[PDB]
Amino acid sequence: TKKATMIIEKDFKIAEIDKRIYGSFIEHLGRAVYGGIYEPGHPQADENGFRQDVIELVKELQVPIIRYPGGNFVSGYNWEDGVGPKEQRPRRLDLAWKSVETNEIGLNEFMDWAKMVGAEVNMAVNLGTRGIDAARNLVEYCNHPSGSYYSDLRIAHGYKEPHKIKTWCLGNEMDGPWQIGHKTAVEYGRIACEAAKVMKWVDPTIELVVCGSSNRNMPTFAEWEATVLDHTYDHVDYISLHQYYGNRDNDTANYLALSLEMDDFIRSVVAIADYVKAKKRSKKTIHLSFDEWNVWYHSNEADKLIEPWTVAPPLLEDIYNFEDALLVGCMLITLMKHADRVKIACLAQLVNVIAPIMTEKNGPAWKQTIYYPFMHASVYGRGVALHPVISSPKYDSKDFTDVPYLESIAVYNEEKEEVTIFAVNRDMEDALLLECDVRSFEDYRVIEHIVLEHDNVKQTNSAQSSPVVPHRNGDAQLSDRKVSATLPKLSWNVIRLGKR
Ligand SMILES: *[C@@H]1[C@H](O)[C@@H](O)[C@H](CO)[C@H]1OS(=O)(=O)O
């Protein structure tokens, strides 16, 4: 064993957590929609063709906001193609994913699905092949009550009450040479500025996300964000950032350190926002939408065998293992550590596509390994993120020095009189004996200690069996104003405290 200490001080706060950091994302990609949320033949389909089993699995994650309809897809998409009578909806070539899109689901049916899972929708506008006229028309269609052509058209399409969508994305990551209608930072900043203005003139209640770089390795990384914000600052509310991780080298110790990079990356994008704030002399603070994050790598070879121009190909179907769940847990803790400036985040994506929920045609829906830490973070991670002051043993890996074995944060919920400690032990060999100073939480007791662990980091779940599942046999105990807990080697831990 090794020892680590953490102070849990009520009055050393980061910020209230915005629940939208537990968001997700559904794109018209692979089986996320067709065979994912929507499967008319299925024994568990509802009156509208939505799979009830998927609905219950999303509800259990308590996802507050879902980005839709893309993603790379949106940059070539015409929103009118997906509304009104099905017979008039055209079949399209989706150039993003080289698929035929039938438009059998469009925005009004997605809104119906979102209402059944209790999520708001973070709606994206196309700024690839389209521009400012389509952006104002879509906001009017969705949000204007009545008495104009596009509002009355929504009513005629069967949706009397406006959708009242709060948060919109200005395009999708347009910086990449593989994007439909790629734009330079100046071209994107200009069209995003002019789109943002007309959107807000239709509905001043909305807020806007301007798109950051596709990834931190782009040649234009950081330059992009600074230029785009220079063009848009007065008209927008968030800047996005995106990250995927993978373990292509089978190096568990280096893999689990990657959240340290995520931490730096968030601090960098915050710095850019605050540079442009100062350059503008603005009183407004721009926050971050971490609107794509996950592990993604396992399905890369399988995707190469998919022929173009099929309907609902099985793209991006990673099957996650236990170490992947540990890294997801470290990523969630990293989001909470930045609750002051990361207000929205989207686990990319929610069903089938690099997803915590997987489905089988005419068959079961099941929870991936990564479902569990996400569920725990969403369910028990509402409240105020506290500033951690930690003394942990550390290790070096290929790409990282001084990696703490302990990754942890506490979240205080004053209304529930609860404190939740999220902790990963990265150690591949030894348990960590965690001692938490809880002097500032008088009359708190341990409620529970949840552990996600498995002897085999490569073990996956499947429709037939779930060997990687949480248990409640964690030994956390409160004695003399100190919580002592054994964190097993390679484990995710949720130590819940409450006033009793
Ligand atoms: C990020 C995009 O917005 C998505 O369409 C996609 C899958 O989540 C990601 O882009 S990438 O070009 O696949 O990395």
From Swiss-Prot:
Catalytic residues of the enzyme: 173 (proton donor/acceptor), 292 (nucleophile)
Q: Where is this site: Important for substrate recognition?
A: 296, 349
Q: What class of enzyme is it?
A: hydrolase
**Reported temperature dependence:** Optimum temperature is 70 degrees Celsius.
Question: Which residues make up the binding site for alpha-L-arabinofuranose?
Answer: 27, 72, 172, 244, 292, 349
Q: Quickly give the catalysed reaction.
A: Hydrolysis of terminal non-reducing alpha-L-arabinofuranoside residues in alpha-L-arabinosides
Disulphide bridges, residue numbers: none
According to UniProt, this protein's pathway is: Glycan metabolism; L-arabinan degradation
Q: Can you list the GO cellular component terms from the UniProt entry? A: cytoplasm
Q: Which residues cross the membrane?
A: none
Q: Give the chief site where it resides.
A: cytoplasm
Q: Recorded E.C. number(s)?
A: 3.2.1.55
GO MF, any single term: alpha-L-arabinofuranosidase activity
**Where is the protein situated, by its record's location annotation?**
Cytoplasm
Q: Which family does it belong to?
A: Belongs to the glycosyl hydrolase 51 family.
Summary of the function given for this chain in its UniProt record: Involved in the degradation of arabinan and is a key enzyme in the complete degradation of the plant cell wall. Catalyzes the cleavage of terminal alpha-(1->5)-arabinofuranosyl bonds in different hemicellulosic homopolysaccharides (branched and debranched arabinans). It acts preferentially on aryl-alpha-L-arabinofuranosides, and is much less effective on aryl-beta-D-xylopyranosides.
Entry's PANTHER family? Answer: ALPHA-L-ARABINOFURANOSIDASE C, ALPHA-L-ARABINOFURANOSIDASE C-RELATED
Task: State the name under which the record lists this protein.
Answer: Intracellular exo-alpha-(1->5)-L-arabinofuranosidase
Q: Which organism is it from?
A: Geobacillus stearothermophilus
Q: Which gene holds the coding sequence for this protein?
A: abfA
